[PDB]
Amino acid sequence: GKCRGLRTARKLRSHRRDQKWHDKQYKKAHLGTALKANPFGGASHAKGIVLEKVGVEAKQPNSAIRKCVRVQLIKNGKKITAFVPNDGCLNFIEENDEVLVAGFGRKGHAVGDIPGVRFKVVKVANVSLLALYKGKKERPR
Amino acid sequence: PVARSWVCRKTYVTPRRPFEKSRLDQELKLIGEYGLRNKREVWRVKFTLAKIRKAARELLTLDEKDPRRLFEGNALLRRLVRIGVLDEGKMKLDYILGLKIEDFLERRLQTQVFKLGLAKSIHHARVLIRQRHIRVRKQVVNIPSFIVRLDSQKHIDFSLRSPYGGGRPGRVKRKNAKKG
Amino acid sequence: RELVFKEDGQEYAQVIKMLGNGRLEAMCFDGVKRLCHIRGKLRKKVWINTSDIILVGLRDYQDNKADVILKYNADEARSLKAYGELPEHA
Amino acid sequence: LGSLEALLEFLKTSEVPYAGINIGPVHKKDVMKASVMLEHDPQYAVILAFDVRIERDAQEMADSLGVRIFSAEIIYHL
RNA sequence: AAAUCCUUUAACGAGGAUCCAUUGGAGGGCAAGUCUGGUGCCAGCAGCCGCGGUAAUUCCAGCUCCAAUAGCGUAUAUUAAAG
RNA sequence: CGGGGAAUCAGGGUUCGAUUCCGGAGAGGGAGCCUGAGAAACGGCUACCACAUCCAAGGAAGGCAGCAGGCGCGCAAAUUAC
């Protein structure tokens, strides 16, 4: 039962205000705990240096070696694993290059197949991977 | 601080569902019938009609004796009679709700140039207007989306300079005349 | 099936301590021990045992891992013994 | 730049590989490139700085991590 | 202010009018191909369900088609959908 | 920083508002004061704290969160113009 009385504005507001914390989205958002834990720290894209290339196996129902890159970020200097998008894009990357990585799409969660990766590489050595894939540019030498 | 205004407005609303048969057809019929460039031009007229309908709807809710409703209602009806989507007989606020997109698309300069028989196709009219051949009153307009006023209808003439009307041969005729 | 003397970006390995959930961890004839993943078609169809000779697809980026291409048996092992494979037993 | 060539041809003669090069004073991105090296080969994670101003944020970041910086105005010392 | 841009107007300027329209898709959600080469649970696609293990409607291509259009993808904060 | 407001939106609401108008605040951090109707002023001074320029080593001079511009920082932002 909800109190409906004309002088229950404080009771309703107090209840609604404190009961919003049991909402997953509101608590993750408003409490400054997601931000510090987030490797980017509330930034759409982030830049890093490549450690090494790595082959991550897919989930149980369908088997394949997903090509990925271990990258250390520039701002906070912590290690993450980024998934290179299109076919043969791993060839264009080399170890110890400067790489711009973006969120995958699902708001900092995993993908259908590739487990334990949040991020995907968008630029390599200040050149877009789409341009290197479509051959509109060439890796600067 | 700068002596500039930042009063800019969006004139079209995109549809809620992007891919929907029955809708896409209806918009393409409108384009096909009135030779419009893209679906932005149909959404523009939908948005303008919607805003007029919302103004009529929010006026209806007020009482029949209110000075504000009377003044605003008369002004809206006067403007819609002026533009030529109604007549003096059907000049009640209730009838504003009984308009549709056809009524507004009929008043495009492109459409009127085609309907008065200056151009011989709905596609030819848009080109003819854009090429600076058409003029209303003594003013040369090249805007297909120029919405013609009811009293301004009875004179759309060829701009005098124009080869078609004025009497001066263009590049093609000049070049053919020199090599003739 | 025919003999396959293929040493073209892929190495022969002796399976040792095959513990994992597909992990494997065998000892390659040329280099050091590596984790050789059970490739799609070898998941349920072909069974690799605790001590076995395998041709592993040397995946050269990281080099601390690989994937098992082919399983061998006694006759093919004895043949491989004959040409090129160390006096290491089969 | 002349000094940078001089240091690189010395490293070439002494047989040491070099990853990154830069002109001007040392910054926190430079010590971070020295840090991202530290994972690979602990010895190689060093900055050879000749006749340039070390920054406080770079120096304290270098001391907080396992990154050493060789500062010297006379090249003999470097 | 002096110029620029625009408007005005002599001369030149359209037949692959080569004076060239892109960005994303074509199994469902969701508009559009069980067409033809290539690869063979490898390479990759896929927001989600899923497609790939030798006739792939979904991968890399060719052709064709759809969507919006001088714009259209992608990531991320936020609003409606969220009774 | 707070308002005037902004985005979205059936009705109710939710979220944003450093940013051209109004009010407040501070000129690297604090503190003290001269002049003046008005300042605890920084394109005024005096001292300390942090940085840093010239030097004949005796002393001297500092303040872009004004317009340009540069370095740094980072995913993120223009011309040393008339």
XYZ file of C-alpha atoms (C1' of nucleotides) in Angstrom:
654
model
C 0.000 0.000 0.000
C 1.132 3.583 -0.922
C 0.370 6.620 1.358
C -1.831 9.041 -0.707
C -2.387 11.808 1.974
C -2.045 15.530 0.967
C 0.935 15.997 3.418
C 2.940 12.809 2.402
C 5.133 14.601 -0.268
C 8.306 14.127 1.911
C 7.512 10.378 2.525
C 6.979 9.668 -1.253
C 10.028 11.789 -2.368
C 12.264 10.179 0.372
C 11.092 6.632 -0.665
C 11.400 7.235 -4.480
C 14.816 8.971 -3.927
C 16.382 6.070 -1.873
C 14.624 3.250 -3.896
C 16.315 4.511 -7.158
C 19.646 3.011 -5.811
C 18.197 -0.564 -6.278
C 18.045 0.318 -10.052
C 21.209 -1.191 -11.723
C 21.582 1.723 -14.278
C 21.086 4.637 -11.780
C 23.510 3.151 -9.148
C 26.210 2.358 -11.819
C 25.739 5.939 -13.236
C 25.347 8.315 -10.208
C 27.726 6.584 -7.678
C 31.279 7.494 -8.899
C 32.573 3.845 -8.795
C 32.056 2.687 -12.467
C 34.173 5.673 -13.760
C 37.468 4.939 -11.837
C 37.125 1.161 -12.673
C 36.396 1.957 -16.412
C 39.820 1.756 -18.209
C 38.971 4.880 -20.378
C 37.384 6.840 -17.446
C 34.219 8.006 -19.306
C 35.940 8.719 -22.698
C 34.359 7.423 -26.000
C 37.804 6.666 -27.595
C 41.283 6.215 -25.987
C 44.882 6.065 -27.403
C 47.525 3.440 -26.374
C 50.821 1.668 -27.347
C 50.701 -2.033 -28.516
C 52.408 -4.654 -26.251
C 51.807 -7.796 -28.400
C 49.364 -9.514 -30.835
C 47.231 -12.350 -29.258
C 44.783 -15.011 -30.630
C 41.614 -15.322 -28.431
C 39.454 -18.495 -28.992
C 35.647 -18.007 -29.512
C 32.803 -19.443 -27.286
C 31.834 -23.200 -27.188
C 29.216 -23.436 -30.022
C 31.507 -22.082 -32.862
C 35.381 -22.355 -32.903
C 37.778 -19.706 -34.405
C 40.970 -17.724 -33.440
C 39.925 -14.010 -33.061
C 43.005 -11.762 -33.717
C 43.547 -9.153 -30.907
C 46.210 -6.686 -29.578
C 47.343 -6.104 -25.932
C 47.601 -2.248 -25.640
C 48.774 -0.038 -22.689
C 46.806 3.300 -22.566
C 48.378 6.849 -22.498
C 46.334 8.627 -19.717
C 46.229 5.973 -16.882
C 48.885 3.554 -18.331
C 46.972 0.256 -17.680
C 46.801 -2.849 -19.983
C 43.693 -3.849 -22.083
C 43.016 -6.301 -25.015
C 41.473 -4.752 -28.219
C 39.896 -6.764 -31.138
C 41.029 -5.697 -34.691
C 37.864 -5.463 -36.876
C 38.032 -6.566 -40.585
C 39.876 -9.467 -42.374
C 43.741 -9.324 -42.351
C 43.891 -5.993 -40.363
C 46.375 -7.657 -37.878
C 49.034 -7.596 -40.715
C 48.916 -3.716 -40.824
C 49.585 -3.484 -36.999
C 53.119 -4.186 -35.601
C 54.370 -4.368 -31.935
C 55.043 -0.953 -30.209
C 52.814 1.254 -32.485
C 50.443 4.097 -31.331
C 46.790 2.861 -31.651
C 43.357 4.571 -31.092
C 40.811 2.044 -29.604
C 36.993 2.518 -29.141
C 34.270 0.688 -27.118
C 32.865 -2.415 -28.921
C 29.160 -1.286 -28.948
C 27.451 -2.996 -25.922
C 28.372 -0.169 -23.426
C 31.494 -1.895 -21.937
C 30.368 -5.589 -22.064
C 31.485 -8.715 -24.066
C 30.607 -9.784 -27.697
C 28.614 -12.814 -29.065
C 31.811 -14.942 -29.561
C 35.013 -13.262 -28.220
C 35.116 -13.539 -24.367
C 36.737 -10.961 -21.992
C 37.255 -8.031 -24.462
C 35.416 -4.628 -24.248
C 37.354 -2.610 -26.927
C 38.121 -2.595 -30.722
C 40.962 -0.822 -32.682
C 39.726 2.064 -34.977
C 43.092 3.779 -35.948
C 46.715 2.451 -36.298
C 49.779 4.828 -36.446
C 47.413 7.862 -36.986
C 45.702 6.080 -40.005
C 42.114 4.604 -40.084
C 42.020 0.745 -40.466
C 39.059 1.132 -42.957
C 41.426 3.178 -45.252
C 44.216 0.490 -44.972
C 41.587 -2.309 -45.509
C 39.985 -0.547 -48.578
C 43.508 0.579 -49.756
C 42.562 4.337 -49.844
C 45.820 4.936 -47.813
C 49.161 3.076 -47.170
C 51.000 2.638 -43.782
C 53.440 5.611 -43.445
C 57.127 4.520 -43.978
C 30.106 38.977 -26.834
C 29.217 39.319 -30.602
C 26.333 41.113 -32.471
C 24.976 37.840 -34.053
C 21.692 35.835 -33.575
C 21.732 31.995 -33.030
C 17.954 31.510 -33.788
C 18.063 28.401 -36.108
C 15.238 25.776 -36.440
C 14.885 22.209 -37.912
C 12.061 22.092 -40.570
C 11.599 18.229 -40.924
C 10.977 15.218 -38.560
C 12.372 11.744 -39.555
C 9.949 8.756 -39.266
C 9.971 6.589 -36.045
C 10.373 3.247 -37.971
C 13.046 3.636 -40.726
C 11.966 0.679 -43.005
C 8.136 0.225 -43.339
C 6.246 -0.759 -46.572
C 2.877 1.111 -46.991
C 4.710 4.303 -45.766
C 7.701 4.261 -48.259
C 5.094 3.680 -51.060
C 2.947 6.679 -49.860
C 6.025 9.050 -49.792
C 7.251 7.768 -53.240
C 3.706 8.373 -54.703
C 3.951 12.028 -53.425
C 7.519 12.400 -54.936
C 6.394 10.750 -58.246
C 3.209 12.921 -58.506
C 4.945 16.294 -57.646
C 8.541 15.556 -58.913
C 10.187 16.255 -55.478
C 14.007 15.744 -55.111
C 14.152 13.620 -51.874
C 11.970 12.462 -48.892
C 13.178 15.492 -46.779
C 10.796 17.677 -48.929
C 7.760 15.396 -48.065
C 8.714 15.345 -44.302
C 9.078 19.209 -44.439
C 5.398 19.581 -45.597
C 4.246 16.874 -43.059
C 6.072 18.837 -40.251
C 4.494 22.226 -41.314
C 0.973 20.622 -41.596
C 1.476 18.830 -38.196
C 2.408 22.207 -36.520
C -0.720 23.915 -38.083
C -2.891 20.923 -36.900
C -1.333 21.060 -33.348
C -2.085 24.865 -33.250
C -5.744 24.193 -34.336
C -6.056 21.277 -31.797
C -4.687 23.385 -28.838
C -7.038 26.308 -29.886
C -10.193 24.016 -29.906
C -9.814 23.186 -26.124
C -10.425 26.901 -25.146
C -14.063 28.193 -24.780
C -15.929 29.665 -27.843
C -16.170 33.226 -26.260
C -12.393 33.616 -25.379
C -10.794 36.714 -27.058
C -7.415 34.855 -27.520
C -9.040 31.817 -29.317
C -11.148 34.179 -31.563
C -8.149 36.421 -32.581
C -5.644 33.493 -33.059
C -8.272 31.301 -34.856
C -9.246 34.112 -37.323
C -5.513 34.924 -37.994
C -4.714 31.195 -38.708
C -7.820 30.782 -40.997
C -7.038 34.140 -42.796
C -3.429 32.910 -43.526
C -4.678 29.437 -44.736
C -7.309 31.203 -46.997
C -4.486 33.612 -48.165
C -2.106 30.679 -49.094
C -5.018 28.873 -50.896
C -5.715 25.498 -49.129
C -9.325 26.601 -48.155
C -12.220 28.894 -49.352
C -14.524 31.522 -47.661
C -17.334 28.886 -47.247
C -15.125 26.319 -45.389
C -13.479 28.940 -43.052
C -14.234 27.252 -39.648
C -11.391 26.165 -37.253
C -12.906 22.584 -37.119
C -12.214 22.142 -40.918
C -8.405 22.838 -40.409
C -8.198 19.167 -39.153
C -9.706 17.977 -42.528
C -6.648 19.137 -44.618
C -3.884 16.767 -45.949
C -0.385 16.817 -47.637
C -1.891 16.962 -51.217
C -3.543 20.400 -50.494
C -0.108 21.933 -49.507
C 1.973 20.217 -52.299
C -0.533 21.629 -54.919
C 0.616 25.219 -53.946
C 4.355 24.632 -54.853
C 5.528 26.983 -57.708
C 6.801 23.778 -59.502
C 3.212 22.326 -59.374
C 1.487 25.633 -60.442
C 4.016 26.184 -63.347
C 3.049 22.609 -64.519
C -0.749 23.102 -63.878
C -0.927 26.490 -65.797
C 0.739 24.829 -68.876
C 4.031 26.841 -68.957
C 5.922 23.489 -68.595
C 4.748 20.224 -70.326
C 5.833 17.871 -67.424
C 6.113 18.061 -63.554
C 9.922 17.386 -63.940
C 10.323 20.122 -66.683
C 8.691 22.774 -64.364
C 11.323 22.291 -61.547
C 14.213 22.660 -64.111
C 12.461 25.668 -65.848
C 12.034 27.428 -62.410
C 15.657 26.544 -61.335
C 17.063 27.821 -64.735
C 15.600 31.364 -63.987
C 12.913 31.145 -66.788
C 9.838 31.652 -64.473
C 8.878 34.915 -62.630
C 5.931 35.885 -60.317
C 4.732 39.569 -60.473
C 7.954 41.404 -61.653
C 10.229 39.128 -59.480
C 12.385 36.299 -61.036
C 12.183 33.357 -58.506
C 14.202 30.066 -58.855
C 12.762 28.281 -55.723
C 10.614 25.164 -56.485
C 9.338 25.274 -52.808
C 8.038 28.897 -53.324
C 4.445 28.471 -51.937
C 2.272 30.701 -54.247
C -0.326 33.080 -52.631
C -4.009 32.848 -53.824
C -4.072 36.464 -55.245
C -0.502 36.070 -56.757
C -1.640 33.010 -58.881
C -3.142 34.947 -61.880
C 0.354 36.061 -63.208
C 3.281 33.548 -63.480
C 5.016 34.639 -66.593
C 8.189 33.904 -68.232
C 10.963 36.145 -67.036
C 11.601 38.611 -69.733
C 15.237 37.965 -70.120
C 14.646 34.250 -70.789
C 15.126 32.675 -74.220
C 11.767 31.031 -73.978
C 10.012 34.243 -73.227
C 12.118 37.326 -73.464
C 13.507 36.838 -76.894
C 17.269 36.373 -76.577
C 18.989 33.197 -77.962
C 21.092 31.173 -75.418
C 24.569 29.501 -75.688
C 23.318 26.500 -77.808
C 21.315 28.727 -80.274
C 24.196 31.341 -80.418
C 26.837 28.574 -81.115
C 24.537 26.876 -83.748
C 23.806 30.360 -85.303
C 27.598 31.179 -85.563
C 28.424 27.685 -87.067
C 25.159 27.736 -89.171
C 45.159 -41.428 -45.773
C 48.584 -40.529 -47.363
C 51.903 -39.497 -45.653
C 52.426 -35.709 -44.977
C 56.114 -34.549 -44.625
C 54.952 -30.888 -44.166
C 57.424 -28.625 -42.211
C 56.061 -25.328 -43.723
C 55.092 -23.007 -40.795
C 54.033 -26.099 -38.715
C 56.043 -28.469 -36.409
C 55.854 -32.099 -35.087
C 55.251 -32.429 -31.276
C 55.050 -35.238 -28.622
C 51.860 -34.805 -26.446
C 52.785 -34.700 -22.800
C 50.628 -33.877 -19.846
C 47.456 -33.292 -21.822
C 45.573 -31.423 -19.231
C 43.184 -28.686 -19.943
C 39.738 -28.399 -21.431
C 41.255 -28.495 -24.839
C 44.562 -27.036 -23.723
C 47.045 -29.888 -24.544
C 50.532 -28.424 -23.782
C 52.880 -30.676 -25.940
C 56.721 -30.715 -26.444
C 57.795 -29.660 -29.987
C 60.745 -31.496 -31.695
C 62.521 -28.197 -32.717
C 61.656 -25.600 -29.991
C 60.230 -25.627 -26.390
C 56.792 -26.777 -24.986
C 53.645 -24.943 -26.324
C 49.824 -24.911 -25.737
C 48.344 -26.535 -28.935
C 44.515 -25.896 -29.113
C 42.189 -28.765 -30.279
C 41.118 -27.467 -33.767
C 37.346 -27.506 -34.654
C 37.269 -30.856 -36.591
C 39.346 -32.620 -33.809
C 36.888 -31.569 -30.971
C 34.802 -34.848 -30.908
C 35.731 -36.779 -34.150
C 39.500 -37.584 -33.583
C 40.889 -38.390 -30.042
C 44.487 -37.318 -29.032
C 45.761 -39.401 -26.014
C 48.271 -38.634 -23.139
C 51.284 -39.803 -25.315
C 50.848 -39.108 -29.099
C 52.757 -37.709 -32.174
C 50.933 -34.642 -33.699
C 51.570 -32.068 -36.509
C 50.783 -28.650 -34.864
C 50.042 -25.430 -36.864
C 52.779 -23.098 -35.468
C 50.822 -19.789 -35.116
C 53.552 -17.125 -35.312
C 52.513 -13.933 -33.599
C 52.848 -14.618 -29.885
C 54.465 -18.101 -30.192
C 53.457 -19.325 -26.759
C 50.427 -21.055 -28.239
C 49.398 -23.109 -31.364
C 46.593 -25.436 -32.701
C 46.798 -29.233 -33.520
C 46.305 -29.787 -37.336
C 46.850 -33.609 -37.605
C 46.951 -36.691 -35.273
C 49.422 -39.514 -36.281
C 49.343 -43.308 -35.526
C 51.942 -46.175 -35.310
C 52.461 -46.878 -39.097
C 52.763 -43.132 -40.075
C 54.943 -42.496 -36.931
C 57.225 -45.461 -37.985
C 57.363 -43.920 -41.548
C 58.167 -40.395 -40.149
C 60.738 -42.157 -38.042
C 62.292 -43.315 -41.242
C 62.788 -39.958 -42.907
C 63.001 -36.929 -40.618
C 62.049 -36.968 -36.950
C 64.635 -37.282 -34.217
C 65.691 -40.606 -32.712
C 63.181 -39.642 -30.012
C 60.789 -42.727 -30.179
C 57.222 -43.217 -31.447
C 68.606 16.870 -34.344
C 72.431 16.751 -34.960
C 72.876 15.523 -31.323
C 70.083 12.876 -31.840
C 71.951 11.466 -34.943
C 75.220 11.491 -32.844
C 73.531 9.432 -30.024
C 71.907 6.953 -32.536
C 75.221 6.279 -34.445
C 76.890 5.722 -30.984
C 74.082 3.179 -30.121
C 74.592 1.623 -33.646
C 78.398 1.326 -32.895
C 77.745 -0.063 -29.317
C 75.020 -2.473 -30.744
C 71.790 -1.420 -28.883
C 68.355 -1.182 -30.617
C 66.282 2.075 -30.202
C 62.423 2.230 -30.329
C 61.407 5.951 -30.066
C 63.183 9.331 -30.689
C 62.046 12.958 -29.930
C 63.362 16.613 -29.898
C 62.919 18.984 -26.870
C 62.347 18.395 -23.101
C 61.242 15.021 -21.521
C 57.449 14.590 -20.767
C 55.167 11.926 -19.123
C 54.342 10.310 -22.570
C 58.141 9.690 -23.105
C 58.560 7.922 -19.676
C 55.262 6.040 -20.518
C 56.907 4.821 -23.825
C 59.934 3.819 -21.633
C 57.367 2.075 -19.280
C 55.537 0.200 -22.156
C 59.094 -1.050 -23.092
C 59.693 -2.267 -19.428
C 57.264 -5.255 -19.962
C 59.444 -6.583 -22.892
C 63.131 -6.152 -21.755
C 63.801 -4.529 -18.305
C 67.332 -3.315 -19.392
C 66.037 -1.551 -22.599
C 63.450 0.573 -20.616
C 65.729 3.703 -20.368
C 65.727 7.322 -21.775
C 69.064 8.817 -23.074
C 68.473 12.622 -22.639
C 71.302 14.933 -23.958
C 71.315 18.681 -22.973
C 67.467 18.849 -22.422
C 65.363 19.959 -19.375
C 63.867 17.014 -17.353
C 60.244 17.771 -16.190
C 59.085 17.153 -12.545
C 56.018 15.030 -13.609
C 58.265 12.940 -15.975
C 61.013 12.517 -13.264
C 58.533 11.571 -10.432
C 56.646 9.195 -12.872
C 60.071 7.645 -13.853
C 61.018 7.187 -10.120
C 57.486 5.770 -9.286
C 57.873 3.152 -12.132
C 61.052 1.100 -12.954
C 62.299 3.609 -15.632
C 65.802 5.240 -15.316
C 66.732 8.530 -17.161
C 70.394 9.420 -18.080
C 70.581 13.286 -17.974
C 73.938 14.867 -19.076
C 75.038 18.172 -20.788
C 78.586 16.835 -21.637
C 78.116 13.792 -23.999
C 81.127 11.920 -22.386
C 79.038 11.521 -19.148
C 76.028 10.086 -21.138
C 37.911 51.773 -43.837
C 40.519 48.970 -47.745
C 39.440 44.302 -49.774
C 36.719 39.495 -50.029
C 31.868 36.847 -50.589
C 27.006 37.569 -52.592
C 23.711 40.065 -56.065
C 24.291 42.466 -61.264
C 26.372 41.730 -66.204
C 30.119 41.586 -71.310
C 33.353 37.128 -73.351
C 34.251 31.533 -72.870
C 31.894 26.874 -70.942
C 27.655 19.967 -71.945
C 26.900 13.817 -75.209
C 29.823 7.909 -72.094
C 26.146 16.268 -70.993
C 34.425 10.967 -68.443
C 31.452 18.718 -65.843
C 31.308 10.712 -63.510
C 27.453 10.638 -55.633
C 28.785 8.760 -51.762
C 28.151 5.989 -47.015
C 26.011 1.518 -45.274
C 23.052 -3.079 -46.091
C 20.562 -7.425 -49.244
C 18.402 -14.931 -43.388
C 14.907 -12.627 -39.329
C 14.383 -8.189 -36.345
C 14.233 -4.562 -41.017
C 13.590 -2.398 -47.009
C 16.594 -5.579 -50.604
C 19.171 -12.131 -54.366
C 18.094 -19.777 -52.499
C 22.510 -15.372 -58.609
C 27.699 -16.936 -59.962
C 33.292 -17.649 -58.716
C 36.516 -18.373 -54.220
C 37.432 -20.491 -48.909
C 36.233 -25.174 -46.120
C 34.109 -24.445 -37.886
C 40.660 -22.010 -41.169
C 39.767 -16.878 -42.781
C 36.205 -13.946 -41.135
C 30.845 -11.999 -40.405
C 27.253 -11.216 -36.405
C 24.322 -4.708 -31.610
C 20.723 -9.785 -30.520
C 19.219 -14.744 -32.429
C 22.858 -16.961 -35.193
C 26.197 -18.024 -40.330
C 30.969 -20.817 -41.470
C 32.979 -28.522 -40.716
C 33.218 -29.140 -49.827
C 26.349 -27.244 -53.383
C 27.538 -20.767 -47.475
C 20.241 -16.768 -49.068
C 24.872 -14.197 -43.710
C 32.503 -14.710 -44.871
C 36.309 -12.581 -49.347
C 34.793 -10.917 -54.486
C 31.831 -10.032 -59.387
C 26.836 -8.746 -61.014
C 22.112 -7.045 -59.481
C 18.899 -4.733 -55.841
C 17.452 -1.767 -51.379
C 17.906 2.566 -47.793
C 18.957 7.749 -46.859
C 21.283 11.255 -49.976
C 25.730 16.012 -50.324
C 25.708 13.404 -46.944
C 25.880 8.360 -44.293
C 28.468 4.998 -40.940
C 30.935 3.905 -35.916
C 31.934 4.885 -30.394
C 30.353 7.222 -25.942
C 26.966 10.653 -22.172
C 21.691 11.546 -22.206
C 15.884 11.522 -23.431
C 11.493 8.743 -25.346
C 10.496 3.471 -25.840
C 10.494 2.180 -19.544
C 3.240 1.206 -16.749
C 29.379 28.753 -9.887
C 23.519 30.277 -9.275
C 19.510 32.027 -12.349
C 17.145 33.795 -17.463
C 17.331 28.985 -20.321
C 18.487 23.850 -23.423
C 17.332 18.683 -25.160
C 13.461 15.278 -25.063
C 8.099 14.839 -24.426
C 0.411 12.433 -24.969
C -0.830 14.080 -19.650
C 2.656 13.694 -15.740
C 7.937 13.723 -16.019
C 13.631 12.917 -16.797
C 18.291 15.061 -18.010
C 21.531 19.097 -19.017
C 22.714 24.534 -18.076
C 31.821 25.985 -18.136
C 29.631 29.067 -22.858
C 27.747 35.564 -25.602
C 22.030 38.547 -20.924
C 21.767 39.171 -15.197
C 24.301 38.331 -10.303
C 28.801 36.107 -7.814
C 33.907 34.932 -7.696
C 39.712 34.912 -9.018
C 44.019 36.638 -11.686
C 50.118 30.577 -9.951
C 49.032 29.855 -3.974
C 48.018 32.723 0.528
C 48.626 37.441 3.336
C 49.245 42.885 3.944
C 48.548 47.810 2.017
C 49.344 52.955 -0.821
C 46.192 56.286 -3.988
C 41.087 57.389 -4.745
C 34.270 58.939 -4.667
C 34.991 53.663 -5.802
C 40.181 48.423 -5.096
C 41.845 44.649 -0.050
C 43.228 46.326 -7.764
C 47.178 42.286 -9.683
C 48.330 44.760 -17.847
C 49.191 48.886 -8.821
C 52.824 47.974 -4.929
C 55.129 44.994 -0.346
C 56.561 40.027 1.871
C 56.645 34.831 2.065
C 55.676 29.756 -0.639
C 56.226 27.145 -5.675
C 58.391 27.822 -10.569
C 61.668 30.683 -13.584
C 64.639 35.102 -16.882
C 69.331 38.113 -17.278
C 74.354 38.607 -14.894
C 80.845 41.260 -15.356
C 78.122 36.934 -9.473
C 78.215 42.866 -7.052
C 72.713 43.060 -8.028
C 68.331 43.448 -11.578
C 63.449 41.920 -13.290
C 58.762 38.303 -13.027
C 52.728 36.922 -13.809
C 48.018 35.118 -20.941
C 41.992 32.157 -16.567
C 42.779 39.811 -22.350
C 43.908 38.976 -28.546
C 47.073 36.055 -31.548
C 50.748 32.173 -30.933
C 53.700 28.105 -28.564
C 54.597 23.867 -25.070
C 52.230 20.377 -22.113
C 47.695 17.468 -21.203
C 44.431 14.426 -23.915
C 39.348 11.270 -27.742
C 38.641 16.779 -27.778
C 39.053 22.920 -30.150
C 41.007 28.266 -35.569
C 45.205 33.429 -37.846
C 51.984 35.613 -34.187
C 46.166 38.512 -39.956
C 43.488 43.976 -41.266
